[PDB]
Amino acid sequence: RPVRTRFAPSPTGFIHLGNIRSALYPWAFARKMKGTFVLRIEDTDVERSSQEAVDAILEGMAWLGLDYDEGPYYQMQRMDRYREVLAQMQEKGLVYPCYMRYDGTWRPEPGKVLPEPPAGVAPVLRFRNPLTGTVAWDDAVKGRVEISNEELDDLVVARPDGTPMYNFCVVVDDLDMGITHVIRGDDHVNNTPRQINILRALGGEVPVYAHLPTVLNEQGEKMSKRHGAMSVMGYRDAGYLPEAVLNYLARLGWSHGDAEIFTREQFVEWFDLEHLGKSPAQYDHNKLNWLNNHYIKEADDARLAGLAKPFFAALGIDAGAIEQGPDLVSVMGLMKDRASTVKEIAENSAMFYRAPAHTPSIDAVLLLFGRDVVVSRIEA
Ligand SMILES: N[C@@H](CCC(=O)O)C(=O)O
Ligand SMILES: [Cl-]
Ligand code: NA
């Protein structure tokens, strides 16, 4: 059956390379298998979610060409659906009210006597998790994982006001959206057994899970905002081209023999879960810089010119001063070859737009400065 993957970010306000890699891989797996890639926004923690955060996710995804086939589906807009499933579960006895790990004191069982519910209390609803046996899956990354159901408990699926809880919302979404493959950070591995049990109890087919190892920073710690990570659009703002960041990130957790340089289309054609790395990958800004230099040489000069404009401003060089100065498109072609970033292009090129206080072939340089400008500057 056709593949259906998803990217289901919680919008907490900051996205680094590690985060957007968890979009890249399910996108690539869907495109490789001619399947569907779904976008879901996990906003049920209203305290730690915002519209700004959502637009930044959409902007980073678009910058990297991670187009999605369905969505964005917002969990906070699916509360009627979640409530409907909870009512069905209660009718079928798959969830029960609790009126106080949890020890199942309020779990109904044939033969067991339950107390009368305390008159003053709105119960929480809990899922009837299996008490015997084990929950196991063949993780595409981690291999066979197996957990005793005795170690799990009867998950709260709804608060006393009836609001559904996070893990339950995930399962309903994965069911409703027909998800076949769940590729996500291994920081979610512990939620997997409880999700599997609910999904199965609801009648679904359990997807294939692939839990990605952490991404490390250059200090060998987990890449994170607190550890000084740059944001995805921070890379753009520092002069990195999207095609470079895409090629770099693809290889930060996945391999295909010796290959290091490849297009998006070739990545899609090659991508496979079997060659996801099984241990953490480590960021290396020198490697990213090499690739960015490579792609800068390859980039169209008029494109580079437009990307360069905000870096010239940062150097006290103005739109008007550029139009009046040497042709920027020609300047880009002449100066880009040594640059690791678009910012460096602009810095190396500022000499064409600054009053004189390092140069390519004298003749090309003179041609781009007008006749009038070269003539006068000599005489003095
Ligand atoms: N919302 C989670 C992903 C959950 C999932 O993929 O099941 C995150 O942002 O890390
Ligand atoms: Cl760490
Ligand atoms: Na000009």
Numbering used by the authors: 3 to 102, 122 to 378, 444 to 466
From the paper:
In general, aaRSs are divided into two classes based on the global fold and sequence conservation. Crystal structures were determined for a CysRS from Borrelia burgdorferi bound to AMP, GluRS from Borrelia burgdorferi and Burkholderia thailandensis bound to glutamic acid, a TrpRS from the eukaryotic pathogen Encephalitozoon cuniculi bound to tryptophan, a HisRS from Burkholderia thailandensis bound to histidine, and a LysRS from Burkholderia thailandensis bound to lysine.
We solved two co-crystal structures of the class Ib GluRS bound to L-glutamic acid, one from B. burgdorferi at 2.6 Å resolution and one from B. thailandensis at 2.05 Å resolution. For example, in the B. thailandensis GluRS structure, His209 makes a hydrogen bond with the main chain carboxylate of the cognate glutamic acid, but a hydrogen bond is not observed from the equivalent Trp residue in the B. burgdorferi structure. In the B. thailandensis GluRS structure several water-mediated interactions were observed in the amino acid binding pocket compared to the B. burgdorferi GluRS structure, presumably due to the higher resolution of the B. thailandensis GluRS structure. The two structures have an RMSD of 1.08 Å and a sequence homology of 34% identical and 53% similar amino acid sequences.
